[PDB]
Amino acid sequence: TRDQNGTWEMESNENFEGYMKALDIDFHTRKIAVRLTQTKVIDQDGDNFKDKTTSTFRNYDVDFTVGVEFDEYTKSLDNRHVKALVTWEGDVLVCVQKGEKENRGWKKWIEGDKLYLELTCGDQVCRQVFKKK
Amino acid sequence: TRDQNGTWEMESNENFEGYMKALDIDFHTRKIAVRLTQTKVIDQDGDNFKDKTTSTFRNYDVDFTVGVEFDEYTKSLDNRHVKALVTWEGDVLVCVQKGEKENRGWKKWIEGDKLYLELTCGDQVCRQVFKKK
């Protein structure tokens, strides 16, 4: 069939590295790109095509229990080892990541249908907001 | 509420760059990471947390009509300009991307519930397989 309609989830990707290198892609981009999986949404009407592709990355699970310090390796970030301790402050989840980096941690809390996440390292604060599906 | 259960879709991300720089993240990784959106799946049982995060990237739409040559800028790859011509060979969609790179194109076809994609540049072939949702 010529009908390529649908959403297609990548299950295999061979020699993406060599294709990317043939295209002169920066080796730092290739090292990240070879990790990605793809979802392709094709809307097709006869010979008219619209191909909508999204690239996706694993990220490691993080499991913890409040009050129990755990070892965390920040793969997908700086790949460092920290000793993380999560505690409640009221309804705010507070994490201190003890390690090389000073003032490293995060705070996580719900308000309404929104999840707030504040990440700290040194004097830098990154504020992320998520909406509930 | 202390109940952080659910799947949470990132809608905002401020100063991720400065947080990442404070963590000494390679500037090539930061240039890609600042583009990503996040989906966070939290399974929470009391004070026991499992946080499953996936990072996601836009990728530009590509719309075309078979037989009509179109200009394509390969953002998300080498960011080059090519003149793309897509044609049918039986049930196989064949694209030649005329430009600086020799033997650059792709072939795309259905077999069963699987979509096959072969990308070529120079003497390099990348073969991708997708499964229908």
Chain A stretch 42-61, residues whose beta carbon is closer than 8 A to a beta carbon of chain B = 47-59, 61
CATH 3.40.140.10 fits B1-133, yes or no: no
Per domain, the residue ranges of chain A are 1-133
Query: What are the angstrom distances between the C-alpha of B101 and each of A105, B93, B124, B127?
Result: 46, 20, 12, 18
**Residue A94 half-sphere exposure toward CB, CA atoms < 13 A:** 7
- Pair A128, B12: CB distance under 8 Å: yes
Contacts of A44 in chain B (CB under 8 A): none
Instruction: Mark out the alpha helices in chain B (DSSP H runs).
Output: 16-22, 27-33
Distance CA A20, CA A37 (A): 15
Distance CA A49, CA B88 (A): 13
Q: Tell me, rounded to whole angstroms, the distance of Cα B99 from its chain centroid.
A: 22
- Please answer yes or no on whether B12 and A124 come within 8 Å at the CB atom: no
Residue with tokens 């929104």, as numbered in its chain: A114
- Pair B8, A130: CB distance under 8 Å: yes
* Of B87, B103, B133, nearest in space to A9 by CA: B133
Min Cα–Cα distance to chain B from A83, Å = 16
Both tokens of residue B12? 């905002």
Instruction: Mark out the alpha helices in chain A (DSSP H runs).
Output: 16-22, 27-33
How were these coordinates obtained? X-ray
Distance CA B16, CA A126 (A): 5
Q: Does A92 touch chain B (CB under 8 A)?
A: no
Beta bridge partners of A43: A50
- Pair B22, A122: CB distance under 8 Å: yes
Q: What angle is formed at CA B42 by the lines to CA B39 and CA B44, rounded to 5 degrees? A: 175
Helix (H, G, I), strand (E, B) or coil at B115: strand
Both tokens of residue A36? 């990605």
The values of phi and psi at residue A39, to 5°, are -120, 130
- Pair B19, A119: CB distance under 8 Å: yes
Task: Please give the single-letter amino acid code of residue A101.
Answer: K
Distance CA B66, CA B81 (A): 19
What's this structure's resolution in Å?
2.0
Helix (H, G, I), strand (E, B) or coil at A103: coil
Residue with tokens 């194109």, as numbered in its chain: B105
The values of phi and psi at residue B54, to 5°, are -130, 135
